[PDB]
Amino acid sequence: KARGNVGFVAGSSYGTGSVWTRNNEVVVLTASHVVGRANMATLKIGDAMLTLTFKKNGDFAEAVTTQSELPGNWPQLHFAQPTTGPASWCTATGDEEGLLSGEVCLAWTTSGDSGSAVVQGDAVVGVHTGSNTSGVAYVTTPSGKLLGADTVTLSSLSKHFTGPLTSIPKDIPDNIIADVDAVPRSLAMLIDGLSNRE
């Protein structure tokens, strides 16, 4: 079951969106490539169907509308810098718990999940942009920075996680440089937690 503010978006492609409140306006986030160059796309949430125009920054797409056009108790929109740790990919079929860092992001997603808000706590860090082999995720922040395209060692990543040393999960992407033979339990369980929205 998806979060209450998560909807489906259809433009040049099919994706996911999220709805929020900010300074008396209703804000809708999704991915630019889901919207498409014509800059128009239709959001479906609850019984509401609304066509919107989006301002874009790289693959991060944001539309604004009003309470009279899209009523509901939408959660307040807070943007925040990425913090190395767990993050929730808010897909239309439930939250996918994944690893988020500036260099590498891991989450089990499909094409339809493009545009899902990626959140940490009560704040949006970006939208889901795309995927690669072995749970690789790419996330675009509101300022248009692409997260997930660089490399990081396991030891460097490990500094950010609590718990005792644990065996490294089997399938990890080449962009995570395996330079230790054990990682903190929370890091291992995160990666092991692959595919958890059900």
UniProtKB/Swiss-Prot annotation:
Where it sits in the cell: the answer is: Host cytoplasm
Query: According to its UniProt record, which residues of this chain constitute the active site?
Result: 33 (charge relay system), 59 (charge relay system), 114 (charge relay system)
Residue stretches making up the Peptidase S32 domain: 1-198
Name of the protein = 3C-like serine proteinase
Give the source species. Equine arteritis virus (strain Bucyrus) (EAV)
